[PDB]
Amino acid sequence: RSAYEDDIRLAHRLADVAADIIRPFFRAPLTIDLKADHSPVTKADRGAEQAMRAILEQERPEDGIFGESRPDARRLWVLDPIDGTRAFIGGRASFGTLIALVEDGRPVLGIINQPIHQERWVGVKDLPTSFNGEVIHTRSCPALDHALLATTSPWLFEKEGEVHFDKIRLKCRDTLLGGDCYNYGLLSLGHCDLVVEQGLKFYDFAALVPIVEGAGGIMRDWQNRPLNKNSVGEVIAAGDHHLIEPALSAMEL
Amino acid sequence: RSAYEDDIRLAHRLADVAADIIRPFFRAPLTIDLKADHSPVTKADRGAEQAMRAILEQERPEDGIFGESRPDARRLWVLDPIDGTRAFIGGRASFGTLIALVEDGRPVLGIINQPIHQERWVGVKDLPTSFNGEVIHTRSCPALDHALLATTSPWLFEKEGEVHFDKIRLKCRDTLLGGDCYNYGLLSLGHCDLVVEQGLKFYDFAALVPIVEGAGGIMRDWQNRPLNKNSVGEVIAAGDHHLIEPALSAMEL
């Protein structure tokens, strides 16, 4: 059993609560061009965040909730009800709810939950990562020219970041596009070898780190340093630790 | 009832047969770097194509099967067991089996089937398009700056085609990436407004045309001409007929 067993149980409860709120809004009609925001994604995100926050305020009174709600605490919860907001808006089920517990600025527990297809990744500092309750493993990869690389969009990079991304893309066997958190889940399951992104907020990667790392992968910034609450959101995830040096090299940073 | 009712029933049978063959291979381990091809996608594609061909040889002896098997016939079946081969290889359930019946070089019946999540689009020349048995409709869209555009990859274009794509992307509200046939299914359901691609084979678009058009959309080449067995594979699909002129204009062809 984990040192975090109680927190893992709460994290599953938060994911369940968010899922039931978000699901009815998926593939709903999209209103446009009004003086106010009538979008389903906004209703889903707000209602899920409010419900999860109310539960955290009752069950973890002493913990912070990242994003202004209490801080200074050693322990902080980080919630993203819908990571992959644009995919959700487009009716794609690659979006996920991300929940993370963070201590001294480091993620120590993370869940990705896809509430439409019921796919749930759980990672924790002291246990192997699980997907729908089963232990999972990243795969090994000999070299970049055998690697599958993913990123949500080339246009989500800064102008110089687009050049670094293009340089590594040219050295990989194939690149798949779109997906946000989902590509990190596929990398933890062993179906993707590298993910490289830029411009993420802490809400977008905190949950991913324990999941990828507890699957046997590695997830760092572009200087190969640990990701933490204060990282600017350049990330690289690899299923194989052997590939992180050649990947960063190929980016010509 | 359709003039194609019998062919629609056969088409569903082909999709079922392909699904049961393909499903076991999804998210299987991926072998690499051998003198022969041990990949699951190749086994799935070949076994599904062989089973569908055997059925067509028994039940439609007089029809062609596109790709060399009999031709010259007025009526041809076009099969793609796994459209979105790279997505399948990456463990993504955006791939689909495409089945189409084509007469005088024009698609008249099409199915997209996603065998993992059981999502099936059916289009036919004389009926409204259906998704899992329900009639569906494309949405209207006032202008490009409100439109959601999708394409599988910017890098799947020719060098000049990348420039035309970038020019229209810059004029749209958002662009989603990856997905192959799946984006045309989302456009027929009313969750996407434009799809623009280049380099497709007839196997990749024949089934899509009846589905998009019978949902109320429009799908043509980049000269606004009909797509047919001989089209080079530049395609534009719009949920709203009003957007095809501004979209082609924005591409600066």
Q: Which residues contact A16 (CB under 8 A, 6 or more apart)?
A: none
The closest alpha carbon to B174, from A152, A227, A236, belongs to: A152
Statement to judge: residues B177 and B126 lie in one domain: no
Which domain-ending residue is among A136, A171, A195?
A136
For an interface test with A, give the residue of B38, B86, B88, B92 to mutate (most A CBs within 10 A): B92
Q: In whole angstroms, what is the distance from residue A206 CA to residue A105 CA?
A: 9
The C-alpha angle with vertex B190 and arms to B184 and B196, in degrees rounded to 5, equals: 35
Q: Which two tokens stand for residue A199?
A: 């411009």
Statement to judge: residues A147 and A78 lie in one domain: no
Q: Which two tokens stand for residue B11?
A: 């088409």
Give the domain CATH number at A4: 3.30.540.10
Which domain-ending residue is among A136, A170, A186?
A136
The pairing of strands B174-177 and B148-151 is: parallel
Q: In whole angstroms, what is the distance from residue B186 CA to residue B77 CA?
A: 24
Number of domains in chain B: 2
Q: How far is A53 from chain B (nearest CA, A)?
A: 30
B30·A191 Cβ contact <8 A: yes
Name residue B176's beta-bridge partners.
B150
A177·B178 Cβ contact <8 A: yes
The three-state secondary structure class of B79 is strand
Collect all residues of chain A within an 8 Å Cβ-Cβ radius of residue B191.
27, 30, 90-91
Tell me the torsion sign for CA atoms B177, A195, B200, B188.
negative
CB B156 within 8 A of CB B199: yes
Statement to judge: residues A34 and A91 lie in one domain: yes
Statement to judge: residues B56 and B172 lie in one domain: no
- The CA-atom distances, in angstroms, between B158 and each of A84, A175, B162 are 29, 17, 6
Q: In whole angstroms, what is the distance from residue A82 CA to residue A207 CA?
A: 13
Tell me the torsion sign for CA atoms B219, B225, B229, B235.
negative
Statement to judge: residues A118 and A6 lie in one domain: yes
Helix A5-22 crosses helix A40-59 at what angle (to 10 degrees)? 150
CB B140 within 8 A of CB B243: no
Q: Which DSSP category does A144 fall into?
A: G
Alpha-carbon radius of gyration of chain A: 18
The closest alpha carbon to A119, from A131, A107, A103, belongs to: A131
Q: In whole angstroms, what is the distance from residue A192 CA to residue A179 CA?
A: 12
Q: In whole angstroms, what is the distance from residue A87 CA to residue A98 CA?
A: 15
Determination technique used: X-ray
Q: Which two tokens stand for residue B107?
A: 């698609």
Domain span including residue A70: 1-136
Q: Which residues contact A175 (CB under 8 A, 6 or more apart)?
A: A148, A149, A150, A151, A169, B153, B155
Name residue A107's beta-bridge partners.
A102
Q: Which two tokens stand for residue A204?
A: 């977008």
Give the domain CATH number at B247: 3.40.190.80
Shortest CA distance from B91: residue in chain A: A191
Helix B5-22 crosses helix B40-59 at what angle (to 10 degrees)? 150
Residue A190, sorted as left (phi over 0), alpha (psi -120 to 50) or beta, turns out to be left
Q: Which residues contact A59 (CB under 8 A, 6 or more apart)?
A: A10
Q: Which residues contact A74 (CB under 8 A, 6 or more apart)?
A: A103, A104
Helix B244-251 crosses helix B159-171 at what angle (to 10 degrees)? 130
Statement to judge: residues B18 and B127 lie in one domain: yes
Question: Rounded to the nearest 5°, which phi and psi values hold at A209?
Answer: -60, -50
Which domain-ending residue is among B91, B115, B136?
B136
Q: Specify the length of chain B in residues.
A: 253
Statement to judge: residues A67 and A120 lie in one domain: yes
Q: In whole angstroms, what is the distance from residue A237 CA to residue A225 CA?
A: 12
Q: In whole angstroms, what is the distance from residue A156 CA to residue A159 CA?
A: 9
Statement to judge: residues B243 and B162 lie in one domain: yes
The resolution in Å comes to 1.9
Tell me the torsion sign for CA atoms A213, A215, A216, A222.
negative
Statement to judge: residues A40 and A116 lie in one domain: yes
Of residues B30, B90, B176, nearest to A176 (C-beta)? B90
Statement to judge: residues A123 and A156 lie in one domain: no
In the block, residue with structure tokens 């799908």: B219
Statement to judge: residues B98 and B180 lie in one domain: no
Statement to judge: residues B28 and B6 lie in one domain: yes
